[PDB]
Design a protein around this ligand. Sequence first.
Ligand SMILES: CC(=O)N[C@H]1[C@@H](O[C@@H]2[C@H](O)[C@@H](O)[C@H](O)O[C@@H]2CO)O[C@H](CO)[C@@H](O)[C@@H]1O
Length: 53
Amino acid sequence: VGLSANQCAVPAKDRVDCGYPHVTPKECNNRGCCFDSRIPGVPWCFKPLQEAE
Ligand SMILES: CC(=O)N[C@H]1[C@@H](O[C@@H]2[C@H](O)[C@@H](O)[C@H](O)O[C@@H]2CO)O[C@H](CO)[C@@H](O)[C@@H]1O
């Protein structure tokens, strides 16, 4: 698995959108991003935490 659980534990308020409305989980995965639909009204597809570039 590429992204770890800890990389995707991003508080809702800090999430940076990596997708767009109605983006699918697979599209999100294919961008190297985190998917979470549990919390409404915040990005469901968001950038992971990782070491900086
Ligand atoms: C209000 C908000 O931040 N919306 C996000 C979020 O949208 C989800 C989903 O993709 C939509 O189809 C649905 O209608 O609303 C969801 C949120 O409740 O996530 C997407 C993807 O990250 C963002 O582009 C939206 O801006």
